[PDB]
Amino acid sequence: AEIYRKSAAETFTQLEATEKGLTTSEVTKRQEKYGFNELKNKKKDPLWKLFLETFKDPMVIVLVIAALVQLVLGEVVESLIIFLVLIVNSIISVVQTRKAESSLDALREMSAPVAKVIRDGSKQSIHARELVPGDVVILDAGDFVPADGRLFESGSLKIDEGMLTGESEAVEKYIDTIPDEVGLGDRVNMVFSGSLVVYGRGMFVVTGTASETEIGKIAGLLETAEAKQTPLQRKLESFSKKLGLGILALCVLIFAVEAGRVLLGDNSADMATAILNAFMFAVAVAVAAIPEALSSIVTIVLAVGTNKMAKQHAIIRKLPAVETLGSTSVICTDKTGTLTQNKMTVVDYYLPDGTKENFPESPENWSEGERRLIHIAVLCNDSNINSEGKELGDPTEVALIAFSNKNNQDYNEIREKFIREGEIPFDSDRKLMSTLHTFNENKAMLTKGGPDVMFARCSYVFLDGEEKPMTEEILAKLKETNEEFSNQALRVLAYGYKRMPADTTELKLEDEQDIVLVGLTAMIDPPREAVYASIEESKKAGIRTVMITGDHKTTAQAIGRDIGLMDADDIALTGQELDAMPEEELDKKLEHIAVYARVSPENKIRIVKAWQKKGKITAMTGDGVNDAPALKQADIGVAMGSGTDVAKDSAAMILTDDNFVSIVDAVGVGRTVFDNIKKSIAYLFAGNLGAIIAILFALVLDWINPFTALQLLFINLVNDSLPAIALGMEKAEPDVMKRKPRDINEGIFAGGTMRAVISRGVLIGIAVIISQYIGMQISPEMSVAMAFTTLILARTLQTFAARSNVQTAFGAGFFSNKYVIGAVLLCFVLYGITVLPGAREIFSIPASFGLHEWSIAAGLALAAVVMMEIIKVVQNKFFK
Numbered sequence: 001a002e003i004y005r006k007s008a009a010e011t012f013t014q015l016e017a018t019e020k021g022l023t024t025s026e027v028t029k030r031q032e033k034y035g036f037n038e039l040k041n042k043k044k045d046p047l048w049k050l051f052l053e054t055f056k057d058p059m060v061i062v063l064v065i066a067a068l069v070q071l072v073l074g075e076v077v078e079s080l081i082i083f084l085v086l087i088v089n090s091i092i093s094v095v096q097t098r099k100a101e102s103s104l105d106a107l108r109e110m111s112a113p114v115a116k117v118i119r120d121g122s123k124q125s126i127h128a129r130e131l132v133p134g135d136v137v138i139l140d141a142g143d144f145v146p147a148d149g150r151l152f153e154s155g156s157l158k159i160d161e162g163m164l165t166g167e168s169e170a171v172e173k174y175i176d177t178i179p180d181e182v183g184l185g186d187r188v189n190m191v192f193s194g195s196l197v198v199y200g201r202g203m204f205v206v207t208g209t210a211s212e213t214e215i216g217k218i219a220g221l222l223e224t225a226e227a228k229q230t231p232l233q234r235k236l237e238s239f240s241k242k243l244g245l246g247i248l249a250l251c252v253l254i255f256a257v258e259a260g261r262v263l264l265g266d267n268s269a270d271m272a273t274a275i276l277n278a279f280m281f282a283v284a285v286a287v288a289a290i291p292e293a294l295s296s297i298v299t300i301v302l303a304v305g306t307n308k309m310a311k312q313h314a315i316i317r318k319l320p321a322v323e324t325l326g327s328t329s330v331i332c333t334d335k336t337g338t339l340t341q342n343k344m345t346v347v348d349y350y351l352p353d354g355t356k357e358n359f360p361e362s363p364e365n366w367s368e369g370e371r372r373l374i375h376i377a378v379l380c381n382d383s384n385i386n387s388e389g390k391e392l393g394d395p396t397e398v399a400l401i402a403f404s405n406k407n408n409q410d411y412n413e414i415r416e417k418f419i420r421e422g423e424i425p426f427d428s429d430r431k432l433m434s435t436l437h438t439f440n441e442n443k444a445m446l447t448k449g450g451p452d453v454m455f456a457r458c459s460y461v462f463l464d465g466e467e468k469p470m471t472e473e474i475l476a477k478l479k480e481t482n483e484e485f486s487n488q489a490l491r492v493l494a495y496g497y498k499r500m501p502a503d504t505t506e507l508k509l510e511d512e513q514d515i516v517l518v519g520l521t522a523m524i525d526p527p528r529e530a531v532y533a534s535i536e537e538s539k540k541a542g543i544r545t546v547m548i549t550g551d552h553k554t555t556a557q558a559i560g561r562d563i564g565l566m567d568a569d570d571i572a573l574t575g576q577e578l579d580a581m582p583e584e585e586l587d588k589k590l591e592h593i594a595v596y597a598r599v600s601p602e603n604k605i606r607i608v609k610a611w612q613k614k615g616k617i618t619a620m621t622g623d624g625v626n627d628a629p630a631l632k633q634a635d636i637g638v639a640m641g642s643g644t645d646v647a648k649d650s651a652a653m654i655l656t657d658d659n660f661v662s663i664v665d666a667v668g669v670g671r672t673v674f675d676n677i678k679k680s681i682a683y684l685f686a687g688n689l690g691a692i693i694a695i696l697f698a699l700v701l702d703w704i705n706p707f708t709a710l711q712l713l714f715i716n717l718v719n720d721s722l723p724a725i726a727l728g729m730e731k732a733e734p735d736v737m738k739r740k741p742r743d744i745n746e747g748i749f750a751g752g753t754m755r756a757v758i759s760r761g762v763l764i765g766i767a768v769i770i771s772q773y774i775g776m777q778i779s780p781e782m783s784v785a786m787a788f789t790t791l792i793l794a795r796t797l798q799t800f801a802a803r804s805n806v807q808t809a810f811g812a813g814f815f816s817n818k819y820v821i822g823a824v825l826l827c828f829v830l831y832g833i834t835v836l837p838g839a840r841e842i843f844s845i846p847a848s849f850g851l852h853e854w855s856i857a858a859g860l861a862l863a864a865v866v867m868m869e870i871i872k873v874v875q876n877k878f879f880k
């Protein structure tokens, strides 16, 4: 807004509105051109496109044409089945992205209305929506801010810009003008919308309404709401086009060859018979070339995914998300509340006499001197622990009693022994807090402050008893330790019991001198106890890790060095450094960005977009509101358990236990799911190709096409639908974790699978053609039946040769997969239903079909899968 670069009273002139009062005519006029202070989602959601957008898929167009042709051919049944499964495949994909919509209601709940406003010179109160630039709004601690603006009177107020910066601590606000261009996190002279004023009073001008404000910027990034195609969807459509082209090639080929047979025929030939024969062949190939169960099967192999994840407290609302995490190569994480748990804890302490490397066990254990600081630090804090144990108060102050409760020392047993009734004033200047302390019969006035200012009024030191003041080795060692702790980016605090006043009625500002300081403590928001392994695990898995944070660069650069994200001598950049960097050099810097710091929401979505353009498919994990842009823009979003509902509803995956390990464990599952679908689709498609090779051979030899409609249909959507899922249920290979991330550009069958698909699909059709020849010698009706028996049995038995393209069924656990054998037996039954005397004529099986003919055809299908199994071992190929 550049207002923080501007002056205080100078801003009201450019707003041309008075700071004292806003007339009713100002409200009218300014509402007419700036509108209300409201956001409404601009989503038509007509669902007409969504119903039509399923016809954008080439797999569906061919089936519509085939079913329409099936209708005029008197083939009503086998056409209505196609219409059924087309509506099935449509209903899947429409509601797969209906729920993938950003909950702008969740962000609407932070509107925070009914804000005190000076209207017509009278102090009044109205909703947030009726606010417009130039108006004067009042802030008192405890209410939220209706909209962003610049404060022209600071009553020492501290606000919590958590939804912008990612830090939940109160930051002081200054009325003074900052004549400098700095970042978005350090807008000290102006406030923003949606933040809670933790402390102090204040007045401010509001530069903008709910539109073109910071939460409105986040809302725009969320309103784009365009998630890229998943690796599965991208690959599958890039192959669905190639698949659809084969149909309009083969239909033309059939319409041509059938016409070619009319020229050389004796007395020409029957013309309508040739045309109609071409049409029967055309529908027979169109139904066989498309695996119409592929959507109903891919959705179920994904049905396994988030179920395996639900046992680890990681929910997935959108199914296609699972496979995405497999192909991920760049993981971008949030610093506060994701790598950490937002809890403030102490890692090391400094006392004049005792500084053990590790904090000791229990107060009845160490017993080293008089723990004066341990006794006064629980008195100088203002944090409370409820019966629930939940956290309330300033986050820096809770670190005094949380670390105390960790060391077998209750937070009440020491706060009840000593009774303090202090003046507890504000910390506008010097960051001071006085109190009344009663020990034995003497008095004290404990006071806490920043180590750089609390030592300025310090006039005593003491180790192992009272040592009064000292000049050397005392004022130089405190700087040594405070500076080494600030080099570790540890928030250090100084606490001095100060027994300056005694039995006085009230503590005065003048008598805060002669301070006697006990000790210093270094608190920091520490990483999760489970994040350190998730980094070595991701690096050995081929995943580059990147931290995207909006906090200070010191803590952001310190965190991660211990974790190992960046190198031992790497450098981070600020959000200002990204506000001025264009896209030309950013992509050359994007490979050495390492870790960011003090970034804005738009900076997070920027990095995700840049990585996508780089060619790497990425993932985003964050917990607050300032991550929802990056989540919705990323391929998949992972929200934390304690994170706000904005990220929870704008993310595809939501883990609830804050266990970051489950992130890396997700990739291992991802690559597995895909690896199964690859070997599932293969199995389902090879059996399709074999059905085509058998049809085409009957056209070039002018035989009755070995299959009919409703027959191939039943094989595709009912018969093989079970073994495809069974192959989906296969076990994961231990070599999956080390393998480099699968590229987004390679095909589905890339990696040696394509050769396996063509091998198995050729063997199926070859056996089927032979069976049709035998039947053709017996009778034309027989050939159809024998060919169908061979197809429905060879695709069934193909599961054994299709469990793995690199290994045989024997030696890889023949009975290992209970689902594979279950499917082979169930498909034996699903074929037995064909020979029933009631359903024998609805499958075009003749009444003369005996067991000897079945012996022949089944021997052929058996020998076909036998061929496949011996073929698999023939070569050193298929290894990638």
Ligand code: BEF
Pocket (backbone or CB within 6 Å): 165, 166, 167, 334, 335, 336, 337, 338, 548, 549, 550, 551, 622, 623, 624, 626
């Ligand atoms: F809490 Be994160 F670092 F934005």
Ligand SMILES: [Mg+2]
Pocket (backbone or CB within 6 Å): 166, 334, 335, 336, 337, 338, 622, 623, 624
């Ligand atoms: Mg966070």
